[PDB]
Design brief:
This is part of a larger assembly, with three copies of chain A. By secondary structure, chain A is mainly β. The first copy, chain A, is built from two helices and 30 strands. In chain A, a hairpin with a 2-residue loop joins β1 (about 15-20) and β2 (about 20-35). The longest helix of chain A has 10 residues, at about 80-85. Chain A is elongated and about 110 Å long. The first copy, chain A, starts with 14 loop residues before the first strand and ends with a strand. β21 (about 335-340) of chain A pairs antiparallel with β2 of chain B. Chain B: It comes from adeno-associated virus 7. Chain B: Belongs to the parvoviridae capsid protein family. Chain B: This is Capsid protein. Chain B: It is found in: Virion. The PDB classes it as virus.
Chain lengths: ~525, ~100, ~100
Amino acid sequence: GADGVGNASGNWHCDSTWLGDRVITTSTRTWALPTYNNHLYKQISSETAGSTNDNTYFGYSTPWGYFDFNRFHCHFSPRDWQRLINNNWGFRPKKLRFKLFNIQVKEVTTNDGVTTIANNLTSTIQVFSDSEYQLPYVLGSAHQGCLPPFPADVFMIPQYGYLTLNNGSQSVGRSSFYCLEYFPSQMLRTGNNFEFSYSFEDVPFHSSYAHSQSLDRLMNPLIDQYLYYLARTQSNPGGTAGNRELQFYQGGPSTMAEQAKNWLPGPCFRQQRVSKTLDQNNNSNFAWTGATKYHLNGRNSLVNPGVAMATHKDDEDRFFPSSGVLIFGKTGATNKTTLENVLMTNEEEIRPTNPVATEEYGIVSSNLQAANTAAQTQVVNNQGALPGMVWQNRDVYLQGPIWAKIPHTDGNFHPSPLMGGFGLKHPPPQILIKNTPVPANPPEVFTPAKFASFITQYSTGQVSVEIEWELQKENSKRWNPEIQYTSNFEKQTGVDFAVDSQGVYSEPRPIGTRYLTRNL
Amino acid sequence: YAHSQSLDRLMNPLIDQYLYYLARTQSNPGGTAGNRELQFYQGGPSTMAEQAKNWLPGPCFRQQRVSKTLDQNNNSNFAWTGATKYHLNGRNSLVNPGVAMATH
Amino acid sequence: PLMGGFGLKHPPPQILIKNTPVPANPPEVFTPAKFASFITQYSTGQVSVEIEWELQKENSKRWNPEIQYTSNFEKQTGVDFAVDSQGVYSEPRPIGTRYLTRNL
C-alpha cells in the first residue's frame, strides 16, 4: 500500500458486467480475523477422541487464516445466476483478481468484566498467497468459511490446518510439517493494501444444457435397419412344444430395444435407494452399514457424492441415492437436522446419458449354455469405463463449489471434481493471513523461555474478488419454448432470495445450471 | 516421490463442511424400539469418513494374500489354483505383477 | 409534479451513505454464524451543494407599479425569518413566486 492512517486504501466495488461473450463478476466483503491457537502451531490427532479406525487422523493446526471464495453465490447474485443459466450452454472462468484493503487492527483488553477495544495503529498483519502450490491445499473440500452469499454480511476468516499421513493416531516417517512463517509474506499496516492477479488454465466449458435425446433413442423411428439381431432361439410356439430354431429380425420402429447402437451409458458405481416418505424405507439403520463406500488402506471411506448418475428413475421423484447427491441446508439449520431442513439436489438431466444411481448398470451372461445347461446371467452393479461410453459431469449449483485441485499423480481418468465444477492442476492459490504477534511487556531480566504473553488483538477489513467468466451461446433451432428458471409469481409472505423481517438472508432452494436443451 | 497425504484426508481438519450426508435411517435408540427417521449431519473433524470428497482411489484387480511366515498360510497349493489370472483365447495367463496397488 | 416544481426524466441522482461495519472481537474459534456484534459508531461531516439557476427577465410595459413581496415595516417583537431569544429559526409564512404580472 501507499498512504497513511486517514486515507482509505481501496474503494468498495461489487457489481456484475455482462459484455458480449463474457461476464465479469466483482464482489466485495467485510471480514474479521481472530488470533488462532494463541500464535501456536499445534499437532492434532484422533487420539484425543478415540473415534474409530476409519476416522483416525494426524495433522497440524496453524495460527494462520485463509480466504475462501470457492462457491458460486460468492460471485453471483440470484438474478445474475439466472441470466447465466437461462441464456447460455456453458461457462468457464478466465481471470481472477484479488484485493485486501482498508485494514484495521484492534487491540482488546479485558478488565473486571468490561471489554475495551481500541485501534492499534502500528500493528501489522501478514498475507501471502501460495503461488507455487507448496502447502497442503485444503480448498475444494467444501468447507464453511467462504464469503457469504449476501454482500451486507460480515464473515470470520476460517483457521488453516492440514492433515498428513498417519498410522492410527500416530505419525509415520513421511508425515510432513509445514511452518507457514517459512514463506515470504507481505506485512501490512492500516495504510497498506494487498493485491494479486491470477489466470485460469484452459478448461472445458461446464455443460449448462440438458440433453433433449437419449442414447438409446438416437435412431430414426421411421426407417428400418439393415442389421439383423437374434430374436428367438425357439420356434414360435403353437401351444404344443418348443422346437429349436434360430430366427433373426431387423431392428425397426416396432422394437427399438433390440436395435443396434454405437454407444453405451456412462460408468456407474451403484448406491442404495432411500425414500423421502419414511414409511417406505426399511426399519433398520442402513445409512452407514448399507452404504456404498470405498476401502483405502484399511479405512472405509463413504463414497460421496460419487460418480455422476441420475438420482431417480423416470416417474419416481421421492427416491434419492443414499450418498449420491449434494445436500444443502435451509437457513437456520443445525449441524444435525431432519429431512425437512435440508435442501436436496437431484440430477434428472443426465438420465439420457447416465445410469440411475440406485439401479443396475446392466446384466451380463455368467455361463456357457449348452443343450442340458440353461443360460444364466449376473447383474452389473459396478462398471468401469468401456470403449464407447459417454456421460455427463455432475451439475454445478449456486451454492456449490466452483473448482477443485487435481492431485499431482502419475495418472488420472477424466479428472473432474465429483462434487462439481472445474478440475484444475493449478487452481487459484490459497491466500493465507495472520495477525502478527505483539508481545506484552518482557520481564526486564533476561530469560530464554518462550513468551506466551501477548497483546490480544484482531483485525478487520474488506476483501474484493473479481472473476472473468467466458460464455457459450445457445445456437438451438428448437421451435418450441425452453424451460426457464422462474420466480414464484403467486403471492407469498416473503420474497425468495431476500432478507426477512429479522434481517436474515436465505436461499430457499438450490439452483442448477441445466435448463436449456440440446441434441445428443 | 511418495505422497505425504492420502486422498481421503485431503480435507481441512479444523473446519466443518456445508454439505450434509445421511447419517441415520432410524431414530437414536433409547433401548426401547427403533423408529424410522432420516437424519442428516455435516461432515466435520469428528467424522472424516462420511465427509464428501472429490476423488476416488485408483482401479484395482484383486489378488491373493500370502504371508512370509509359513505357518500363517493355508496348507494347500493355491499358487496357480488360487491365482489371479486373465483369460485370453482359451489360455489362462497369470497376471504378473499386474495393476499397481499397495502391497500390504 | 402535482405538488410543484420541475418534472424530470433524469432528476438529480440519489446520494446514499452508510457507516461501514466494524466488527467487535471475534470468538477465536471458528463459527460460521453471522456476527451481529459490532462497534457502535457514527459519523459526522459537512456537505455542500451548488446549483446554477437560469433567470427569465421581466419585459413588461405596464405603467403602474407591480405587487412585490415586502417586509412587515411596523414594529414587532421579533424579526421574521430570524432566530428568536431561544435560538430557534422559524419561517412565519409560505412564500410563492407569483407576484409580477403579464398579459394572458
